[PDB]
């Protein structure tokens, strides 16, 4: 279900330090990592419906 | 090639101009469509078209901008940005109608000790949001078209309050792609990422895109070139580093119709 | 050859791996998305896939009648000092948000248009008098044609313009319209202007709205109650349902993330913070 | 002029392909209903718009 | 090959018997039922059987429109202080007993659903004013979609959701719905929970209802009167008839012997004595 | 696309098999009516679910 | 491969776990023998064996240790080290007999400005020397088997002197491989060297080795994983640098016999 539901729950996605980010001198000890999500060719959706991500109060 | 050839090292040649690069992340061809001339089956204007070829279909280098910890992003519009570029701008202004593709080459080098990621995006019909909350679609022709120097994005939306004498210009907020939609999704659009640790630049080959076979290049801008810092510039320990972002662009398979006297726009 | 309703690709049995091949590793910088599948990063079993993308196809996604406007007309008592109220609506998909947001997932579009009209009426005054069954006249006035100035002036003759004479209480009115655009495809977005500001010519003259093409894209819908003034006043409402059929779309875009503010892409102060608070390390 | 087609059958009764008949009453294509007999295409032009075709098993950057 | 409507097996002529064969004798302990027939325990004549089990087939048994709910909506006078009453019903076959008991003769089920809507209206006040013919809007709101908060808020646009615009006085509305279950078959019974109570985690958090799966199985039916507020108040009722077509059923069960008590198998004190007094040796 | 079938005829008039014609208007199976052309099956899986097949003339337990 | 493929870049996949590496010095297969199930011709225990497959034959990551100028070395024993690892440890304890191979992946990255060499060795029947000079072969089961956290080597042999209440544990001296033989020769054993300037890690594929076709996994440890600093850790100029050494291991073609009630060892 396209909503928060105990019965149809997907599980947990977590990230960790296997070893540790190592850098030499004269270099920034802090950096940013960007993350992207997309669907595999086995992916599909059904039961067309109106979304809550947009509205017209008035 | 066991012979030497590689994805990172390219050589682009158009007319009398040639671009070389030893650190590229391959190249992108918008919607898998390589620029092309207007076909007879799809043609509209009946008059013999003007095809400048090498005189206009070459590489023009715009004014180099500076990337810093503070930078929120930069934007340009085509053909607007090339309007004053040699024979291409001349032919664009002398004709009622005109169509053109582009080879966009964004240059930005640094060092193995620098950090940062430039999100380079090619957006069809890149309509931007205005600076007014009392009125709409009010951004003036002069302000909507910065020419070669282009415009820039803001981390914050600050409404034009001078009702009497309106700034009549754009207020493009970075995280909203300057147009009411979330930046994180800008990737559905033809693009490339300039990740300092991986590559010097971004090469995008753009086709002529539009609801019409050919249109008014002076009244209408087909493509929008948006460059935003996905990951902020950062160096060794310097609190205020800096690196240049040079933008070189070349018109392609471009052609023009409806020839008459030169168009002298009110650009100020 | 691949049909929208064909079963998606079957998951193939995959065993262990100790090779020089690196599917999991890549470089998003190139502008491309890693074509990976479960069997590339983990040991998978053989699965015969029955699922389909039938309902997510362009036609299927829009194959639904959506409300684009609510027109208000009326039929007062002859005596009233105020004019018999007849409706004039400038045709468009932007007066409402739902359908507009869906169409806007894309730059250009092409399609035969199906317009369905739901008409509801009611009494306005704590009166008791009644009214005979009303007959509405929905006239289509294309850009250039004489726009009606009175619930009963010469224009309602519709000699050339297309008019629908709807009878109250009967199955909601419906008509089809071809791809009528003066362009090879509808433009959900126009990054330019209808005019070129010429130096040599006075500022105010060369001026025009940003992102706005034909001042009058598709003309207007002029609705009225054909019946003569009735002693007891009756107010009616015409709900217009728009459905895009035989549709095609080009150049995808990121959905509208913040409250619509007018016919253009303009956003308004106080509505720019869609996303809610949620910690980096909290499930 | 009758157009006969196949229904992709979901939940079958305790009751071989099933068909449905369609006939066009109007002269104008616009008047016609939606076939829903539509085609899929490969995302390539959007997910992999790169000049040099990419092989997933090998190094994206080489 | 055997059709539901084929004539049952003919009774064969059977004479006397003095053998070592013992059909009449058996052992129910094994879990099986003695396949015996009249000719096994008595002298029978030859009979050509014409009778059929046609009407007792799964489809035939349920091939009937059954009332699953009664929705109440209304349209008051603009002035009234109280809100225009629009109905919101959570779709299900358990609000009523008849159809539920029939479906429950089995553990799992599968079928295309046919919903028929019977709409009746009436006047509430000893008034005398009248009201123009009403037009109802039956909107289907699937789990996740913006549920309506006002008889006239933005949600009624139904850009994506399926809506039925019914006109009073006309043949009762009707629509068909496929097998929409997120499972390979509808579960008349779920011997478990939607959540797993984890020690390491606070009691109240891991808690959930017994026998209850998806908090929101199939969304809801949102009904309203499209017509604007009318001087004279008119109350309407929407009766929903549910019919299971193209149906299949698995794992049979003993019919509900005592008064239903909620959506689950729960029984209530004072209702546990169905059977009546009747003596062992009395005909 | 017309589907012609036989009616199992009950009370015949003082008036050879009789037939009825059926045609599907919609693209979705769900929209279709009930065929009623259903099949019977042998109760075995419920009346005799035992591992070792049973012969009625012989001793159930042996 | 002119196509891109290389010795330094690998991708290992077992069950639901996948390991990637862009800086490897190839991989080693002990005695040229790839792990395998027990053949009928060589089989002993007559009962239908238990083969967990993907449930146990996957990658378990042990507790990450810290490498410093002071470190003398680390040691582990198989299967002991994996005894508490998900379904693999469960199946190992429920059965009298068990046999298993391993894919040992030692991870240790740094920087082009760091120095040092980790000698990673796979030793069959790695019997270690005790802490006592008054008695022998006295090291207790609890101390001989550290489990996941493993043990460590000492630059000096210091005898347990408490005759009354003996420490009853190992005193493995680095230069003597903790067992009476010269470290310089440990290389006759299946191994790889993690030289900071050349590679991030070491991958050793170990086969089931032993005087028997199958044995008691709880009583006996088939392989010993020894990691010693051939060349001391060193960075830029920092007097006390540090880098993590993460050890990830995966059981292979593993199988079990003699099923009964779970074995609850006295591990303390
Ligand atoms: C009696 C009823 C007659 C109905 C006549 C309707 C004809 C007009 C239909 C115009 C269709 C407009 C659809 C939306 C187009 C917009 O997206 C444009 N701004 C884009 O090009
Ligand atoms: C405009 C009208 C649209 C009508 C939309 C109806 C769609 C929802 C139908 C849900 C069918 C539910 C049938 C009963 C299922 C229950 O037995 C479940 N608890 C068992 O899985």
PDB file of N, CA and C in Angstrom, chain B residues 25 28 77 124-125 127-130 133 136-137 139 141 157 159 168 171-173 175 179-181 188-189 191-193 195 198 209-212 218-221 264-266, chain C residues 29-31 107-108 183-185 187 189-194 196-199 201-203 207 209-210 212 251-258 261 265-269 272 275:
ATOM      1  N   UNK B  25      33.348  12.887 -17.855  1.00  0.00           N
ATOM      2  CA  UNK B  25      32.407  11.702 -17.513  1.00  0.00           C
ATOM      3  C   UNK B  25      31.432  11.284 -18.709  1.00  0.00           C
ATOM      4  N   UNK B  28      26.458  13.566 -22.774  1.00  0.00           N
ATOM      5  CA  UNK B  28      24.966  13.335 -22.902  1.00  0.00           C
ATOM      6  C   UNK B  28      24.177  13.946 -24.118  1.00  0.00           C
ATOM      7  N   UNK B  77      19.605  31.136 -20.631  1.00  0.00           N
ATOM      8  CA  UNK B  77      18.543  30.728 -21.633  1.00  0.00           C
ATOM      9  C   UNK B  77      18.960  30.776 -23.148  1.00  0.00           C
ATOM     10  N   UNK B 124      14.016  21.950 -20.970  1.00  0.00           N
ATOM     11  CA  UNK B 124      13.025  22.470 -22.034  1.00  0.00           C
ATOM     12  C   UNK B 124      11.907  23.482 -21.533  1.00  0.00           C
ATOM     13  N   UNK B 125      11.767  24.520 -22.264  1.00  0.00           N
ATOM     14  CA  UNK B 125      10.789  25.580 -21.742  1.00  0.00           C
ATOM     15  C   UNK B 125      10.912  26.000 -20.195  1.00  0.00           C
ATOM     16  N   UNK B 127      10.545  27.849 -17.846  1.00  0.00           N
ATOM     17  CA  UNK B 127       9.783  29.030 -17.228  1.00  0.00           C
ATOM     18  C   UNK B 127      10.076  29.298 -15.684  1.00  0.00           C
ATOM     19  N   UNK B 128      10.624  30.428 -15.457  1.00  0.00           N
ATOM     20  CA  UNK B 128      10.973  30.792 -14.027  1.00  0.00           C
ATOM     21  C   UNK B 128       9.961  31.687 -13.226  1.00  0.00           C
ATOM     22  N   UNK B 129       9.978  31.448 -11.958  1.00  0.00           N
ATOM     23  CA  UNK B 129       9.060  32.284 -11.046  1.00  0.00           C
ATOM     24  C   UNK B 129       9.430  33.811 -10.775  1.00  0.00           C
ATOM     25  N   UNK B 130       8.425  34.599 -10.836  1.00  0.00           N
ATOM     26  CA  UNK B 130       8.640  36.093 -10.629  1.00  0.00           C
ATOM     27  C   UNK B 130       8.876  36.583  -9.146  1.00  0.00           C
ATOM     28  N   UNK B 133       4.393  39.139  -5.321  1.00  0.00           N
ATOM     29  CA  UNK B 133       3.234  38.436  -4.632  1.00  0.00           C
ATOM     30  C   UNK B 133       1.784  39.069  -4.756  1.00  0.00           C
ATOM     31  N   UNK B 136       1.056  38.546 -11.052  1.00  0.00           N
ATOM     32  CA  UNK B 136       1.738  37.323 -11.680  1.00  0.00           C
ATOM     33  C   UNK B 136       2.199  37.385 -13.187  1.00  0.00           C
ATOM     34  N   UNK B 137       3.007  36.405 -13.509  1.00  0.00           N
ATOM     35  CA  UNK B 137       3.553  36.395 -14.935  1.00  0.00           C
ATOM     36  C   UNK B 137       3.989  37.826 -15.437  1.00  0.00           C
ATOM     37  N   UNK B 139       7.114  39.351 -14.951  1.00  0.00           N
ATOM     38  CA  UNK B 139       8.590  39.599 -15.282  1.00  0.00           C
ATOM     39  C   UNK B 139       8.911  40.173 -16.727  1.00  0.00           C
ATOM     40  N   UNK B 141      10.374  41.566 -20.265  1.00  0.00           N
ATOM     41  CA  UNK B 141      11.286  41.002 -21.340  1.00  0.00           C
ATOM     42  C   UNK B 141      12.831  41.260 -21.100  1.00  0.00           C
ATOM     43  N   UNK B 157      13.270  33.067  -0.987  1.00  0.00           N
ATOM     44  CA  UNK B 157      12.238  33.955  -1.675  1.00  0.00           C
ATOM     45  C   UNK B 157      11.753  35.326  -1.051  1.00  0.00           C
ATOM     46  N   UNK B 159       9.982  38.637  -1.755  1.00  0.00           N
ATOM     47  CA  UNK B 159       8.997  39.407  -2.637  1.00  0.00           C
ATOM     48  C   UNK B 159       9.205  40.942  -2.924  1.00  0.00           C
ATOM     49  N   UNK B 168       9.880  44.145 -11.403  1.00  0.00           N
ATOM     50  CA  UNK B 168       9.443  43.276 -12.584  1.00  0.00           C
ATOM     51  C   UNK B 168      10.481  42.192 -13.073  1.00  0.00           C
ATOM     52  N   UNK B 171      12.486  35.723  -9.300  1.00  0.00           N
ATOM     53  CA  UNK B 171      13.017  35.296  -7.927  1.00  0.00           C
ATOM     54  C   UNK B 171      13.214  33.730  -7.737  1.00  0.00           C
ATOM     55  N   UNK B 172      14.027  33.250  -8.634  1.00  0.00           N
ATOM     56  CA  UNK B 172      14.310  31.770  -8.641  1.00  0.00           C
ATOM     57  C   UNK B 172      15.002  31.170  -7.428  1.00  0.00           C
ATOM     58  N   UNK B 173      14.190  30.561  -6.613  1.00  0.00           N
ATOM     59  CA  UNK B 173      14.760  29.859  -5.373  1.00  0.00           C
ATOM     60  C   UNK B 173      15.431  28.441  -5.605  1.00  0.00           C
ATOM     61  N   UNK B 175      16.433  25.479  -4.112  1.00  0.00           N
ATOM     62  CA  UNK B 175      15.758  24.158  -3.814  1.00  0.00           C
ATOM     63  C   UNK B 175      14.394  23.862  -4.554  1.00  0.00           C
ATOM     64  N   UNK B 179      11.336  27.405 -10.127  1.00  0.00           N
ATOM     65  CA  UNK B 179       9.959  27.240 -10.724  1.00  0.00           C
ATOM     66  C   UNK B 179       8.766  26.462 -10.049  1.00  0.00           C
ATOM     67  N   UNK B 180       8.847  26.369  -8.769  1.00  0.00           N
ATOM     68  CA  UNK B 180       7.734  25.668  -7.997  1.00  0.00           C
ATOM     69  C   UNK B 180       7.868  24.106  -7.808  1.00  0.00           C
ATOM     70  N   UNK B 181       8.921  23.622  -8.329  1.00  0.00           N
ATOM     71  CA  UNK B 181       9.216  22.118  -8.191  1.00  0.00           C
ATOM     72  C   UNK B 181      10.568  21.737  -7.453  1.00  0.00           C
ATOM     73  N   UNK B 188      15.242  14.250 -13.816  1.00  0.00           N
ATOM     74  CA  UNK B 188      14.367  13.669 -14.941  1.00  0.00           C
ATOM     75  C   UNK B 188      14.665  14.381 -16.341  1.00  0.00           C
ATOM     76  N   UNK B 189      15.294  15.523 -16.090  1.00  0.00           N
ATOM     77  CA  UNK B 189      15.822  16.328 -17.290  1.00  0.00           C
ATOM     78  C   UNK B 189      17.306  16.117 -17.837  1.00  0.00           C
ATOM     79  N   UNK B 191      20.791  15.835 -18.302  1.00  0.00           N
ATOM     80  CA  UNK B 191      21.888  16.423 -17.446  1.00  0.00           C
ATOM     81  C   UNK B 191      23.203  15.614 -17.168  1.00  0.00           C
ATOM     82  N   UNK B 192      24.051  16.324 -16.565  1.00  0.00           N
ATOM     83  CA  UNK B 192      25.378  15.727 -16.090  1.00  0.00           C
ATOM     84  C   UNK B 192      25.939  16.398 -14.756  1.00  0.00           C
ATOM     85  N   UNK B 193      26.555  15.612 -14.010  1.00  0.00           N
ATOM     86  CA  UNK B 193      27.133  16.168 -12.722  1.00  0.00           C
ATOM     87  C   UNK B 193      28.692  16.379 -12.684  1.00  0.00           C
ATOM     88  N   UNK B 195      31.323  16.451 -10.655  1.00  0.00           N
ATOM     89  CA  UNK B 195      31.989  16.093  -9.337  1.00  0.00           C
ATOM     90  C   UNK B 195      33.562  16.220  -9.194  1.00  0.00           C
ATOM     91  N   UNK B 198      35.942  13.534  -9.673  1.00  0.00           N
ATOM     92  CA  UNK B 198      35.784  12.677 -10.931  1.00  0.00           C
ATOM     93  C   UNK B 198      35.982  13.347 -12.348  1.00  0.00           C
ATOM     94  N   UNK B 209      14.143  21.535 -29.426  1.00  0.00           N
ATOM     95  CA  UNK B 209      12.828  21.101 -28.787  1.00  0.00           C
ATOM     96  C   UNK B 209      11.657  22.158 -28.719  1.00  0.00           C
ATOM     97  N   UNK B 210      10.538  21.690 -29.139  1.00  0.00           N
ATOM     98  CA  UNK B 210       9.338  22.615 -29.181  1.00  0.00           C
ATOM     99  C   UNK B 210       7.962  22.194 -29.821  1.00  0.00           C
ATOM    100  N   UNK B 211       6.953  22.774 -29.263  1.00  0.00           N
ATOM    101  CA  UNK B 211       5.552  22.477 -29.840  1.00  0.00           C
ATOM    102  C   UNK B 211       5.361  22.812 -31.387  1.00  0.00           C
ATOM    103  N   UNK B 212       6.372  23.490 -31.841  1.00  0.00           N
ATOM    104  CA  UNK B 212       6.413  23.887 -33.310  1.00  0.00           C
ATOM    105  C   UNK B 212       7.723  23.474 -34.097  1.00  0.00           C
ATOM    106  N   UNK B 218      13.715  35.284 -31.045  1.00  0.00           N
ATOM    107  CA  UNK B 218      13.739  36.576 -30.217  1.00  0.00           C
ATOM    108  C   UNK B 218      12.627  36.729 -29.097  1.00  0.00           C
ATOM    109  N   UNK B 219      11.501  36.210 -29.466  1.00  0.00           N
ATOM    110  CA  UNK B 219      10.325  36.199 -28.493  1.00  0.00           C
ATOM    111  C   UNK B 219      10.312  34.981 -27.481  1.00  0.00           C
ATOM    112  N   UNK B 220      10.863  33.938 -28.025  1.00  0.00           N
ATOM    113  CA  UNK B 220      10.857  32.626 -27.252  1.00  0.00           C
ATOM    114  C   UNK B 220      12.179  31.808 -27.054  1.00  0.00           C
ATOM    115  N   UNK B 221      12.420  31.533 -25.815  1.00  0.00           N
ATOM    116  CA  UNK B 221      13.607  30.657 -25.473  1.00  0.00           C
ATOM    117  C   UNK B 221      13.384  29.099 -25.251  1.00  0.00           C
ATOM    118  N   UNK B 264      15.954  45.400 -33.845  1.00  0.00           N
ATOM    119  CA  UNK B 264      16.643  46.157 -32.718  1.00  0.00           C
ATOM    120  C   UNK B 264      15.869  46.215 -31.356  1.00  0.00           C
ATOM    121  N   UNK B 265      16.020  45.126 -30.682  1.00  0.00           N
ATOM    122  CA  UNK B 265      15.299  44.994 -29.339  1.00  0.00           C
ATOM    123  C   UNK B 265      15.578  46.044 -28.192  1.00  0.00           C
ATOM    124  N   UNK B 266      14.544  46.267 -27.475  1.00  0.00           N
ATOM    125  CA  UNK B 266      14.735  47.159 -26.242  1.00  0.00           C
ATOM    126  C   UNK B 266      15.268  46.353 -24.962  1.00  0.00           C
TER     127      UNK B 266
ATOM    128  N   UNK C  29      27.669  10.742 -12.280  1.00  0.00           N
ATOM    129  CA  UNK C  29      28.149  11.996 -13.027  1.00  0.00           C
ATOM    130  C   UNK C  29      27.897  12.077 -14.606  1.00  0.00           C
ATOM    131  N   UNK C  30      27.993  10.877 -15.125  1.00  0.00           N
ATOM    132  CA  UNK C  30      27.726  10.733 -16.631  1.00  0.00           C
ATOM    133  C   UNK C  30      26.279  11.140 -17.139  1.00  0.00           C
ATOM    134  N   UNK C  31      25.445  11.274 -16.149  1.00  0.00           N
ATOM    135  CA  UNK C  31      23.994  11.644 -16.459  1.00  0.00           C
ATOM    136  C   UNK C  31      23.014  10.402 -16.555  1.00  0.00           C
ATOM    137  N   UNK C 107       6.097  18.633 -20.369  1.00  0.00           N
ATOM    138  CA  UNK C 107       6.187  19.956 -21.149  1.00  0.00           C
ATOM    139  C   UNK C 107       5.145  20.201 -22.314  1.00  0.00           C
ATOM    140  N   UNK C 108       5.110  19.243 -23.176  1.00  0.00           N
ATOM    141  CA  UNK C 108       4.122  19.284 -24.305  1.00  0.00           C
ATOM    142  C   UNK C 108       3.062  18.091 -24.325  1.00  0.00           C
ATOM    143  N   UNK C 183      -0.683  24.977 -32.926  1.00  0.00           N
ATOM    144  CA  UNK C 183       0.717  24.333 -32.917  1.00  0.00           C
ATOM    145  C   UNK C 183       0.692  22.737 -33.072  1.00  0.00           C
ATOM    146  N   UNK C 184       1.796  22.224 -33.401  1.00  0.00           N
ATOM    147  CA  UNK C 184       1.833  20.698 -33.500  1.00  0.00           C
ATOM    148  C   UNK C 184       1.622  19.859 -32.180  1.00  0.00           C
ATOM    149  N   UNK C 185       1.478  20.672 -31.176  1.00  0.00           N
ATOM    150  CA  UNK C 185       1.207  20.132 -29.760  1.00  0.00           C
ATOM    151  C   UNK C 185       0.950  21.210 -28.604  1.00  0.00           C
ATOM    152  N   UNK C 187       1.172  23.404 -25.549  1.00  0.00           N
ATOM    153  CA  UNK C 187       2.347  23.825 -24.663  1.00  0.00           C
ATOM    154  C   UNK C 187       2.058  24.105 -23.124  1.00  0.00           C
ATOM    155  N   UNK C 189       3.903  24.606 -21.039  1.00  0.00           N
ATOM    156  CA  UNK C 189       4.875  25.759 -20.740  1.00  0.00           C
ATOM    157  C   UNK C 189       5.616  26.585 -21.877  1.00  0.00           C
ATOM    158  N   UNK C 190       5.435  27.832 -21.805  1.00  0.00           N
ATOM    159  CA  UNK C 190       6.061  28.739 -22.848  1.00  0.00           C
ATOM    160  C   UNK C 190       7.127  29.775 -22.338  1.00  0.00           C
ATOM    161  N   UNK C 191       8.329  29.263 -22.285  1.00  0.00           N
ATOM    162  CA  UNK C 191       9.453  30.178 -21.802  1.00  0.00           C
ATOM    163  C   UNK C 191       9.780  31.435 -22.708  1.00  0.00           C
ATOM    164  N   UNK C 192       8.752  32.207 -22.843  1.00  0.00           N
ATOM    165  CA  UNK C 192       8.898  33.467 -23.679  1.00  0.00           C
ATOM    166  C   UNK C 192       7.639  34.421 -23.717  1.00  0.00           C
ATOM    167  N   UNK C 193       7.728  35.301 -24.623  1.00  0.00           N
ATOM    168  CA  UNK C 193       6.571  36.293 -24.840  1.00  0.00           C
ATOM    169  C   UNK C 193       5.816  36.474 -26.221  1.00  0.00           C
ATOM    170  N   UNK C 194       4.653  36.960 -26.117  1.00  0.00           N
ATOM    171  CA  UNK C 194       3.857  37.215 -27.414  1.00  0.00           C
ATOM    172  C   UNK C 194       4.303  38.491 -28.258  1.00  0.00           C
ATOM    173  N   UNK C 196       7.726  41.382 -29.061  1.00  0.00           N
ATOM    174  CA  UNK C 196       9.177  41.834 -29.003  1.00  0.00           C
ATOM    175  C   UNK C 196       9.436  43.383 -28.770  1.00  0.00           C
ATOM    176  N   UNK C 197       9.704  43.656 -27.541  1.00  0.00           N
ATOM    177  CA  UNK C 197       9.992  45.130 -27.212  1.00  0.00           C
ATOM    178  C   UNK C 197      11.081  45.892 -28.082  1.00  0.00           C
ATOM    179  N   UNK C 198      10.582  46.587 -29.029  1.00  0.00           N
ATOM    180  CA  UNK C 198      11.526  47.351 -29.939  1.00  0.00           C
ATOM    181  C   UNK C 198      12.034  48.754 -29.442  1.00  0.00           C
ATOM    182  N   UNK C 199      13.332  48.784 -29.206  1.00  0.00           N
ATOM    183  CA  UNK C 199      13.919  50.122 -28.762  1.00  0.00           C
ATOM    184  C   UNK C 199      13.159  51.372 -29.393  1.00  0.00           C
ATOM    185  N   UNK C 201      10.822  51.970 -30.494  1.00  0.00           N
ATOM    186  CA  UNK C 201       9.335  52.103 -30.145  1.00  0.00           C
ATOM    187  C   UNK C 201       8.917  52.158 -28.616  1.00  0.00           C
ATOM    188  N   UNK C 202       8.117  53.124 -28.355  1.00  0.00           N
ATOM    189  CA  UNK C 202       7.623  53.326 -26.917  1.00  0.00           C
ATOM    190  C   UNK C 202       7.471  52.075 -25.952  1.00  0.00           C
ATOM    191  N   UNK C 203       8.225  52.164 -24.902  1.00  0.00           N
ATOM    192  CA  UNK C 203       8.148  51.026 -23.865  1.00  0.00           C
ATOM    193  C   UNK C 203       6.768  50.251 -23.670  1.00  0.00           C
ATOM    194  N   UNK C 207       5.370  45.914 -24.674  1.00  0.00           N
ATOM    195  CA  UNK C 207       5.133  45.081 -23.419  1.00  0.00           C
ATOM    196  C   UNK C 207       4.073  43.911 -23.484  1.00  0.00           C
ATOM    197  N   UNK C 209       2.778  39.929 -21.235  1.00  0.00           N
ATOM    198  CA  UNK C 209       2.915  38.926 -20.109  1.00  0.00           C
ATOM    199  C   UNK C 209       3.946  37.755 -20.299  1.00  0.00           C
ATOM    200  N   UNK C 210       4.698  37.561 -19.255  1.00  0.00           N
ATOM    201  CA  UNK C 210       5.692  36.429 -19.300  1.00  0.00           C
ATOM    202  C   UNK C 210       5.068  34.969 -19.323  1.00  0.00           C
ATOM    203  N   UNK C 212       3.134  33.845 -21.402  1.00  0.00           N
ATOM    204  CA  UNK C 212       1.772  33.910 -22.106  1.00  0.00           C
ATOM    205  C   UNK C 212       1.708  34.118 -23.684  1.00  0.00           C
ATOM    206  N   UNK C 251       8.640  15.236 -23.327  1.00  0.00           N
ATOM    207  CA  UNK C 251       9.561  15.898 -22.299  1.00  0.00           C
ATOM    208  C   UNK C 251       9.060  16.009 -20.802  1.00  0.00           C
ATOM    209  N   UNK C 252       9.271  14.926 -20.135  1.00  0.00           N
ATOM    210  CA  UNK C 252       8.845  14.887 -18.662  1.00  0.00           C
ATOM    211  C   UNK C 252       9.413  15.979 -17.665  1.00  0.00           C
ATOM    212  N   UNK C 253       8.607  16.281 -16.737  1.00  0.00           N
ATOM    213  CA  UNK C 253       9.038  17.275 -15.670  1.00  0.00           C
ATOM    214  C   UNK C 253       8.666  16.916 -14.158  1.00  0.00           C
ATOM    215  N   UNK C 254       9.485  17.450 -13.331  1.00  0.00           N
ATOM    216  CA  UNK C 254       9.130  17.268 -11.847  1.00  0.00           C
ATOM    217  C   UNK C 254       7.765  17.916 -11.350  1.00  0.00           C
ATOM    218  N   UNK C 255       6.968  17.077 -10.842  1.00  0.00           N
ATOM    219  CA  UNK C 255       5.605  17.596 -10.359  1.00  0.00           C
ATOM    220  C   UNK C 255       5.564  18.907  -9.470  1.00  0.00           C
ATOM    221  N   UNK C 256       4.534  19.633  -9.688  1.00  0.00           N
ATOM    222  CA  UNK C 256       4.389  20.902  -8.836  1.00  0.00           C
ATOM    223  C   UNK C 256       4.469  20.685  -7.255  1.00  0.00           C
ATOM    224  N   UNK C 257       5.622  20.989  -6.770  1.00  0.00           N
ATOM    225  CA  UNK C 257       5.856  20.802  -5.260  1.00  0.00           C
ATOM    226  C   UNK C 257       5.209  21.805  -4.214  1.00  0.00           C
ATOM    227  N   UNK C 258       4.897  22.932  -4.745  1.00  0.00           N
ATOM    228  CA  UNK C 258       4.225  23.996  -3.881  1.00  0.00           C
ATOM    229  C   UNK C 258       2.932  24.705  -4.453  1.00  0.00           C
ATOM    230  N   UNK C 261       0.034  29.337  -7.838  1.00  0.00           N
ATOM    231  CA  UNK C 261      -0.234  30.824  -7.690  1.00  0.00           C
ATOM    232  C   UNK C 261      -0.421  31.600  -9.051  1.00  0.00           C
ATOM    233  N   UNK C 265       4.068  29.706 -13.604  1.00  0.00           N
ATOM    234  CA  UNK C 265       4.897  28.936 -12.570  1.00  0.00           C
ATOM    235  C   UNK C 265       5.181  29.659 -11.192  1.00  0.00           C
ATOM    236  N   UNK C 266       4.677  30.861 -11.179  1.00  0.00           N
ATOM    237  CA  UNK C 266       4.855  31.713  -9.936  1.00  0.00           C
ATOM    238  C   UNK C 266       4.428  31.121  -8.538  1.00  0.00           C
ATOM    239  N   UNK C 267       5.368  31.206  -7.661  1.00  0.00           N
ATOM    240  CA  UNK C 267       5.058  30.798  -6.250  1.00  0.00           C
ATOM    241  C   UNK C 267       4.868  32.026  -5.265  1.00  0.00           C
ATOM    242  N   UNK C 268       4.163  31.760  -4.263  1.00  0.00           N
ATOM    243  CA  UNK C 268       3.908  32.873  -3.274  1.00  0.00           C
ATOM    244  C   UNK C 268       4.413  32.684  -1.808  1.00  0.00           C
ATOM    245  N   UNK C 269       4.956  33.759  -1.341  1.00  0.00           N
ATOM    246  CA  UNK C 269       5.487  33.723   0.094  1.00  0.00           C
ATOM    247  C   UNK C 269       4.576  32.988   1.160  1.00  0.00           C
ATOM    248  N   UNK C 272       6.250  28.119   0.462  1.00  0.00           N
ATOM    249  CA  UNK C 272       7.530  27.464  -0.016  1.00  0.00           C
ATOM    250  C   UNK C 272       8.215  26.356   0.851  1.00  0.00           C
ATOM    251  N   UNK C 275       8.046  20.131   2.516  1.00  0.00           N
ATOM    252  CA  UNK C 275       8.588  19.011   3.375  1.00  0.00           C
ATOM    253  C   UNK C 275       8.549  19.196   4.933  1.00  0.00           C
TER     254      UNK C 275
END
